[PDB]
Amino acid sequence: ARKYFVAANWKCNGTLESIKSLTNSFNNLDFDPSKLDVVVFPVSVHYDHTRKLLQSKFSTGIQNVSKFGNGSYTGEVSAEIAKDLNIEYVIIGHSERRKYFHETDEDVREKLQASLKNNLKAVVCFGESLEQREQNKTIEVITKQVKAFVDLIDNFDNVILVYEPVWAIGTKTATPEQAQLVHKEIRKIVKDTCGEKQANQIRILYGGSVNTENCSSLIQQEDIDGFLVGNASLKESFVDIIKSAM
Amino acid sequence: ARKYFVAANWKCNGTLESIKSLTNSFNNLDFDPSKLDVVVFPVSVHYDHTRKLLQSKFSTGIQNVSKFGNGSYTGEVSAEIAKDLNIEYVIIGHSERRKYFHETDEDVREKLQASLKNNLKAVVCFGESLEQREQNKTIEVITKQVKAFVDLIDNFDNVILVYEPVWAITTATPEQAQLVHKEIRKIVKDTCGEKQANQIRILYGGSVNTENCSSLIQQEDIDGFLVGNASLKESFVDIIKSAM
Secondary structure: OOOOEEEEEOOEOOOHHHHHHHHHHHHOOOOOOOOOEEEEEOOHHHHHHHHHHOOOOOEEEEOOOOOOOOEOOOOOOOHHHHHHOOOOEEEEOOHHHHHHOOOOHHHHHHHHHHHHHOOOEEEEEEOOOHHHHHOOOHHHHHHHHHHOOHHHOOOOOOEEEEEOOOOOOOXOOOOHHHHHHHHHHHHHHHHHHOOHHHHHHOEEEEOOOOOOOOHHHHHOOOOOOEEEEOHHHHOOOHHHHHHOOO | OOOOEEEEEOOEOOOHHHHHHHHHHHHOOOOOOOOOEEEEEOOHHHHHHHHHHOOOOOEEEEOOOOOOOOEOOOOOOOHHHHHHOOOOEEEEOOHHHHHHHOOOHHHHHHHHHHHHHOOOEEEEEEOOOHHHHHOOOHHHHHHHHHHOOHHHOOOOOOEEEEEOOHHHOXOOOHHHHHHHHHHHHHHHHHHHOHHHHHHOOEEEOOOOOOOOHHHHHOOOOOOEEEEOHHHHOOOHHHHHHOOO
């Protein structure tokens, strides 16, 4: 049914040289992009270098997008600009942006609306805190977070959800069964808010700590459709993680 | 004599095509980079395109930089990364970032620090609100904003100040701007020394266009500008000329 989706969030890391080396390793993997989505999210200033280096079987995107259009928004990258550059994907709502940059559910909603308007595909992150989990609020928190934006989705292939177990960020970690349980609940939320067919198509990624050791166990879960990978994505062995989804 | 510095803040504007024509027009202007600094600040994803297209007489920079180093800061660009790419300049503390993204004085201080640590050159922005101006607090506010970071400056060619009359963003007269600029230079002198204060460029960051640019730059203490909408136009070259 669902096409699996493996994403590398490089976060704020890299040099021109490190990228050349890593993309080179990545290019050695022969996968079929018609069957699997594999997306790399470099730093904005690294995007051109990275895109040029990566073979086109690899999709590419950026780690954040403006909630505003073009105009007087110094330091921001608009969805129109991304579209002009053929930047395919954007990450929205990463826990780090919510933490450091005070991004809200409202910002996430705006960014999503902007991205969709400009025919961008969106990878939208959410998840609950340790305290929220301790107080048994996980479902309540996620439901609010999803409902913040979910009504905007028209094409359920073009928005991809990520569950971040923010409570884990260390410490840690969710068992694969524990993630699966959350992913199943997220899909129910989509089903009841959007519709069953829609909930059945949408990809839901695990956004916790993923590595060569746990990826197979994670992808095997019924409602886990892929991953947004952090530190492990900075390593040549990331290809092994992609392989788990092949 | 201070070397004049004219900057294009493209803000969140451009396409590959528009930049291609705009840079070509700019390239037609014959100027000597040893006599003035002309810096272009494209959107981040436009940096390589712009840098390639612009001839070397033009300097380039980015519109913001992280206060954090490399690491788990999704969506940020580190000073280290900018250094690796030989991105020469960064803008810090622009009023838009203060307004929309809640950037503080402390943020500005940390951003400057990261930049200097990484041998980037910094164009640092500040200025008072309408309420602050109406309340006759302009000096108190400016002194506070400047003293937030000014002590960090280790080379007075490499950090450039910009006064943004945010109050007027809905202008300042050139005479009004000149008085603020002089006041800024006096704060720098008070904190950094006289020779240092004489050396540092202080730019006007209010609305600049081909009409008003000469009137501003000819003021004793206004050393150039950080230019907005006008910098998106082929006639931006006429603004540069006011500094030539």
